């Protein structure tokens, strides 16, 4: 899998959650973005390392408080991908909140 298909599935699950919940506010949009980045996660390990190998991602991150301290590598990688998906779904759902209100 690539970064683009996983991100498309991410905001697809996000817009399905918006159509299911009928969310108008931005402060209620942000919790839906966090729950949608909590959703739509791959269980194949090869896809998880393929997200880390594809473009549109960096090794260094801005926040270090969300980085866990454990011997599990997949938990640290899942937290990093979760933070990146929250940032990217916020950046590409700020417009989608207006688009959904302008559809219906």
């Amino acid at each position: 899998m690539t970064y683009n298909n996983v991100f498309d599935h991410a905001y697809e699950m996000l817009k399905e959650n918006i159509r299911y919940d009928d969310i108008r506010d931005t402060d209620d949009l942000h919790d839906a973005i966090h729950m949608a980045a909590d959703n739509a996660v791959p269980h194949y390990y090869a896809d998880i390392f393929s997200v880390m190998a594809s473009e549109g991602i960096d090794l260094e991150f801005e926040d270090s408080g969300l980085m866990p301290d454990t011997k599990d590598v997949i938990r640290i990688l899942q937290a990093r991908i979760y933070e990146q998906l929250t940032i990217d779904l916020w950046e590409d759902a700020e417009d989608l909140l207006n688009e959904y209100l302008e559809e219906v």
């Binding site: 506010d25 931005t26 402060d27 209620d28 942000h30 919790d31 473009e55 549109g56 991602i57 960096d58 090794l59 991150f61 801005e62 926040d63 270090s64 940032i87 916020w90 950046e91 700020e94 417009d95 909140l97 207006n98 209100l101 302008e102 559809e103 219906v104």
Partner: protein, 1323 residues
């Protein structure tokens, strides 16, 4: 005080410090002392103006008799709206200021400039004891973040040479000292040094943001918000209750936090409590500026804030918030539709109750001028008591005045039309019956709106540009306009229908004397086979009438209508039954010949005679008019018997389910077609009353057959549904249900049959319910993508033309060439009926004479001086559009062509029914010799010639010079006819199925080693298959010539998947053998919004170069499948395909730059970058026209082509440019710079050419300005980018002059806009 450009950016703080006033410290309550809030409280007395005409702010000096006095308590002056730009409250507050343009907007201005991560931007507040400002003996970083104990350790260890502040003002203490001219050059050298994925992902765009910020000329120290700007209460909405879901909640919160801060800074409180008050002050201030910042969830009512201080520019994220919302326009009204058919096309009505107060100042002015009402109060006593004088003035004004009418949903340009009012008793307007169907509004309670134009030029444009007598030929459609329905066509069909046995048969009589005979007695209107006098005029010279007389065989009603027919018209348009199409073509001929005024008068007279003789005709349906077919029950019984016997053999075990389904489909189709034929041939010849022949086939006197033969709205399906069976129709797909429904409207329906009927009806209503959001949202994007269009050039001067190749398929043409000749103007290369000569001097209009000239010549397609190509480098020109409006003149400069083009796309797509309901040979229908063009002919040993190519084109000269037969043969077929063999039509020329595309081999010889395995490629129960690519997954190479010869002496041997090839190994067969037989939601959509989003296909095609030799290795390798043999080998460029369709690249398909379709439709990104611009444009136009002819609504090609031109924005130019390295550049701004690169004669200054597909939605939501492309956007994130970039607008776009309001450059005022060109430049 004029204005030219509007530039919004962050100004200098020195003007704010010069305007520093106000006392907004303590939140005292509102008192009732001087009927307004007092000093130093809620709505403090500093920034107030006079709430009445002339006053002070306390009950003091500055009466109207004295001016220019400084106030005693306050600092306000006498004059209004000029002191208010100076007296604004500028008090320093919250030194940890808000930086929400780095929080709310996606780029960060203050964060990316000082190398600050976004997590630190989100964590500015709740901070831990300051950031160390750099100095002399400082060891750590100038932007190093430390904790409280670490900062205390740094404070006790550093000592001397250390100046820092407490809160977040220290960053401002850097920004006051920021004279930086070094770090941005280091960042751009780092950007030009390396290029990888860690610099592309959100580093390159912020580096270019810093480049645009450092070159804007503004200082970074101007970004410091030292003070809090307070708006004046006179400019804000005044509220003396006073707080009801408004600004006052956050207002009193900010003033209360300010009072707590000032009190604890004056009383010397400890650090923790003042830190808590400063962070609560910051939580008040940032919520006062911009709500949310991804936190502070909304509780609901007044305990939580709703309207902030910057929420005035956008309170609602819908369509009406401060961006020129829908204003309630005065001198207007709303009215209810009816119809009065007694006025002309120029005349209409208006209610008495509305029109008495639509012209109040006109009646007042006439009463002042006539000298009867000397005062305005006397004018009120004359108007509001209804004396006869104001009735005469009302009659004088209403008789000559243009009044606009429109609809509240207005999705066409035809909605706003001016008419002339008439005083009619009642309070309901009527609508003219040649206008009602143009508004698409039936008489079902729809409500229209009435507007009154108020100036000289508005009345002149209402009487000259916008009415019904100057909007003809339907520019949204390009088809005939308004011929009525169900009444005028019915009357003109009844009065012109011939029938035998007339009263007083065979009279010789003149023209008007038939109306003399018909009105009294003893004459019928049918009147067949009688020769009378008729006078017909013709025109052969330059508008000269030829006086002729004739004795012609006609009826009474046709010869009465011949007086209604004007002077010069042909006669063959009268002798028919005169249905709807006959009146439509008669209107087309009279509009083509006699002009505009005679065809308007003649359409008015058609309306008059139709609604005057519809009462004389008489329509009637009843219990005996519905003809029951006498052979209905026998057909129903034999069909039920056939279905019963076939389901008996079905349950016997011989027929499968899908076979029973298709048999049910075609057998019930045969059944209700037999019922339809039975009611037809029992409906034709019922009337046998005649004269002198005593047996004659005559048209029956039933009404349903007359409304069916009239063809206005009555079709054949409703005719077979009324008197015959209803049919079989399902809800989800419109399928045919196997349960028998043999009902009729003459008999009693079953419960379950009516239940399936309401299945069908509710499914049809659920399908038609989609038309609201489909039409309301698409036209928004279609108009918003075509905003910046100013037509400003008449001399176009281009060389590249467009080959107008139609979509001709079959014998009879589907889309003709005559609609493509008219309109656009062809280029300098067109030909006469003579061979190899020229026809135009490159400036020639194209209509019916020149259409006949371009029809009689021998050419398949011509090139057109037209759009997009080279564009004159000054606007869009005029020869690309030509003539599509009501006037035949060329559409000159200053006309909004794109706004007409955007509304002319999905005008009535509306998804009519069931989402537009979504051979085994090649049979020809036209004669002519077959010449194989672009076909690799391989001689077969069987005696025939197979087609080993995919492209097939042919030009035919039989009657016309244009071709009528292409018949694109699929790849891998057997042509039954040789090259150059005459065909007579109706004969199969290719004996191969079109659904199967195999690969015919190119060379004979020995079979490539593809030895079998048990279960891998063979299936055993010659017919011995050797290779199956779809089963194994290709391990195949080029075959030898005879035994082992190479193929270098005159591109890969293929086999299809899941097939059983009859050719085995060691057979030595010849060249040219054919291999084995084995090779709805998308089409239902309008397919318009997905092309604007730049959609991605499922599988892209394979692109290559001129060297297009292909080969394959093993089944799979370490890399992906199909490592490419072409491209790589002469030019290093690789491609990776995980999974696609089967490869069809062979020697028959020539591969060049811009390769043919190999694996599905290729995306138009690479098709625009590599194939061409006009190819992608014509492909998009042909796909949209194929969708529209599948739907059944014809549209305009020029409008779709202008829309595709608007899709051509946001290209990435060649890196050999001035400050350009793979940058998304505007296409118009790139083609302005052609002359700058031509005069300098350097390839380093500008790029050569570029064109990218990048989305029409993104091009419509991100334009050259910030005022436009902001309706369906967030205003704050656009204004912050416009303030950081410092970009002006120059007031040129159409949406810009809509929102701001000036002389709009579209229409009649563009020359007035050119007067501005005479005002600024050399004026």
């Amino acid at each position: 005080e004029e204005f030219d450009a509007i530039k919004i950016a962050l100004a200098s703080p020195d003007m704010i410090r010069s305007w520093s006033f106000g006392e907004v410290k303590k939140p005292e309550t509102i008192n009732y002392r001087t009927f307004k809030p007092e000093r130093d409280g809620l709505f403090c007395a500093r920034i107030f103006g006079p709430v009445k005409d002339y006053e002070c702010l306390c009950g003091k000096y500055k009466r109207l008799k004295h001016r220019g006095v400084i106030c005693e308590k306050c600092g306000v002056e006498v004059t209004q709206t000029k002191v208010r730009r100076e007296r604004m409250g500028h008090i320093e507050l919250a030194s940890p200021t808000a930086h929400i343009w780095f929080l709310k907007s996606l780029p960060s201005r203050i964060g990316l400039l000082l190398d600050m991560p976004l997590r630190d931007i989100e964590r500015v507040l709740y901070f831990e004891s300051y950031v160390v400002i750099e100095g002399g003996m400082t060891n750590l970083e100038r932007q190093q973040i430390l904790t409280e104990e670490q900062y205390l350790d740094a404070l006790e260890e550093f000592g001397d040479e250390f100046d820092a502040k407490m809160g977040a003002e220290a960053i401002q203490a850097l920004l006051k000292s920021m004279d930086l001219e070094q770090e941005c050059e280091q960042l751009r050298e780092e950007l030009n040094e390396t290029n990888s994925e860690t610099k592309r992902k959100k580093l390159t765009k912020r580096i270019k943001l810093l480049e645009a910020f450092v070159q804007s000329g503004n200082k970074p120290e101007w970004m410091i918000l030292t003070v809090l700007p307070v708006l004046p209460p006179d400019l804000r909405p005044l509220v003396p209750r006073f707080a009801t879901s408004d600004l006052n909640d956050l207002y009193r919160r900010v003033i209360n936090r300010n009072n707590r801060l000032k009190r604890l800074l004056d009383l010397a409180a400890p650090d923790i409590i003042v830190r808590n008050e400063k962070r609560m002050l910051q939580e008040a201030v940032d919520a006062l500026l911009d709500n949310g910042r991804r936190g502070r969830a909304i509780t609901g009512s007044n305990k939580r804030p709703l309207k902030s201080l910057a929420d005035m520019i956008k309170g609602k994220q819908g369509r009406f918030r401060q961006n020129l919302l829908g204003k309630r326009v005065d001198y207007s009204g709303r009215s209810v539709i009816t119809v009065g058919p007694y006025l002309r096309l120029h005349q209409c009505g208006l209610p008495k109750k509305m029109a008495l107060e639509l012209f109040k100042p006109f009646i007042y002015g006439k009463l002042e001028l006539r000298g009867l009402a000397t005062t305005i109060k006397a004018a009120k006593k004359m108007v509001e008591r209804e004396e006869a004088v104001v009735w005469d003035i009302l009659d004088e004004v209403i008789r000559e005045h243009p009044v606009l009418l429109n609809r509240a949903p207005t999705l066409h340009r035809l909605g706003i039309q001016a008419f002339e009012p008439v005083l009619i008793e009642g309070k309901a307007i009527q609508l003219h019956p040649l206008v009602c169907a143009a508004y698409n509004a039936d008489f079902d309670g729809d409500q229209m709106a009435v507007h009154v134009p108020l100036t000289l030029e508005a009345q002149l444009e209402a009487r000259a540009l916008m009415m019904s007598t100057n909007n003809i030929l339907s520019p949204a459609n390009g088809e005939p306009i308004i011929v009525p329905s169900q009444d005028v066509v019915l009357g003109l069909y009844y009065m012109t229908r011939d029938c035998v046995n007339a009263k007083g048969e065979g009279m010789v009589l003149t023209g008007p004397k038939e109306a003399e005979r018909l009105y009294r007695s003893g004459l019928a209107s049918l009147h067949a086979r009688v020769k009378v006098r008729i006078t017909e005029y013709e025109k052969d010279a330059n508008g000269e009438l030829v006086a002729k007389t004739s004795l012609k065989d006609t009826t009474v009603g046709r010869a009465i209508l011949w007086m209604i027919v004007p002077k010069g018209l042909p006669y063959s348009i009268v002798n028919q039954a005169l249905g709807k199409k006959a009146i439509s073509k008669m209107l087309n001929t009279c509009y083509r010949i006699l002009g505009l005024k005679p065809t308007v008068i003649f359409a008015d007279q058609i309306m008059y005679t139709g609604f005057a003789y519809a009462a004389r005709s008489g329509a009637s349906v009843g219990i005996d008019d519905m003809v029951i077919p006498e052979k209905k029950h026998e057909i129903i019984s034999e069909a039920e018997a056939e279905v019963a016997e076939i389901q008996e053999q079905f349950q016997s075990g011989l027929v499968t389910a899908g076979e029973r389904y298709n048999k049910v489909i075609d057998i019930w189709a045969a059944a209700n077609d037999r019922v339809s034929k039975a009611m037809m041939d029992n409906l034709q010849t019922e009337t046998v009353i005649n004269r002198d022949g005593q047996e004659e086939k005559q048209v029956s006197f039933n009404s349903i057959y007359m409304m069916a033969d009239s063809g206005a709205r009555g079709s054949a399906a409703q005719i077979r549904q009324l008197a015959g069976m209803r049919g079989l129709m399902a809800k989800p797909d419109g399928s045919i249900i196997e349960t028998p429904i043999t009902a009729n409207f003459r008999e009693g329906l079953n419960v379950l049959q009516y239940f399936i009927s309401t299945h069908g009806a509710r499914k049809g209503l659920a399908d038609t319910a989609l038309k609201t959001a489909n039409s309301g949202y698409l036209t928004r994007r279609l108009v918003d993508v075509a905003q910046d269009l100013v037509v400003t050039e008449d001399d176009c001067g281009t060389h590249e033309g467009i080959m107008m190749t139609p979509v001709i398929e079959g014998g009879d043409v589907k889309e003709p060439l005559r609609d493509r000749v008219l309109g656009r103007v062809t280029a300098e290369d067109v030909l006469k009926p003579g061979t190899a000569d020229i026809l135009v001097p490159r400036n020639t209009l194209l209509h019916e004479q020149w259409c006949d000239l371009l029809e009689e010549n021998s050419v398949d397609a011509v090139k057109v001086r037209s759009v997009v190509s080279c564009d004159t480098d000054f606007g869009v020109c005029a020869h690309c559009y030509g003539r599509d409006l009501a006037r035949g003149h060329i559409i000159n400069k200053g006309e909004a062509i794109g706004v007409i083009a955007a509304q002319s796309i999905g005008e009535p797509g509306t998804q009519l029914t069931m989402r537009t309901f979504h051979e085994s040979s090649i049979q020809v229908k036209n004669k002519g010799s077959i010449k194989l063009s672009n076909v690799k002919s391989v001689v077969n040993s069987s005696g025939k010639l197979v087609i080993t190519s995919r492209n097939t084109e042919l030009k035919l000269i039989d009657e016309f010079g244009r071709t009528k037969e292409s018949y694109k043969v699929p790849y891998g077929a057997v042509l039954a006819k040789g090259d150059g063999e005459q065909v007579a039509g109706g004969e199969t020329v290719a004996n191969w199925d079109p659904h199967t595309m195999p690969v015919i081999t190119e060379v004979s010889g020995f079979v490539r080693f593809t030895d079998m395995i048990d279960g891998q490629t063979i299936t055993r129960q010659s017919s011995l298959v050797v290779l199956d690519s779809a089963e194994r997954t290709r391990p195949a190479l080029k075959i030898v010539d005879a035994q082992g010869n190479d193929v270098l002496i005159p591109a890969q041997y293929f086999l299809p998947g899941k097939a059983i090839v009859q050719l085995e190994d060691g057979v030595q067969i010849s060249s040219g053998d054919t291999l084995a037989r084995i090779p709805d939601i998308t089409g239902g959509l309008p397919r318009v919004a997905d092309l604007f989003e730049a959609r991605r296909p499922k599988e892209p095609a394979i692109l290559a170069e001129i060297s297009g030799i292909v080969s394959f290795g093993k089944e799979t390798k370490g890399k992906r499948r199909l490592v490419i043999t072409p491209v790589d080998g002469s030019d290093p460029y690789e491609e990776m395909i995980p999974k696609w369709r089967q490869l069809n690249v062979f020697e028959g398909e020539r591969v060049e730059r811009g390769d043919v379709i190999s694996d599905g439709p290729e995306a138009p990104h690479d098709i625009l970058r590599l194939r061409g611009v006009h190819a992608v444009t014509r492909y998009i136009v042909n796909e949209v026209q194929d969708v529209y002819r599948l739907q059944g609504v014809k549209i305009n090609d020029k409008h779709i082509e202008v829309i595709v031109r608007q899709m051509l924005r946001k290209a990435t130019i060649v890196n050999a440019g001035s400050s350009d390295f793979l940058e998304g550049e505007q296409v118009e701004y790139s083609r302005v710079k052609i002359a700058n690169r031509e005069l300098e004669a350097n390839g380093k200054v500008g790029a050569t050419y570029s064109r990218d597909l990048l989305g029409i939605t993104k091009a419509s939501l991100a334009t050259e300005s910030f005022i436009s492309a902001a309706s369906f956007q967030e205003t704050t994130r656009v204004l912050t980018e416009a303030a950081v970039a410092g970009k002006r607008d120059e007031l040129r776009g159409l949406k810009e002059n809509v929102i701001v309001g000036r002389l709009i450059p579209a229409g009649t005022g563009y020359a007035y806009h050119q007067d501005r060109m005479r005002r600024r430049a050399a004026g």
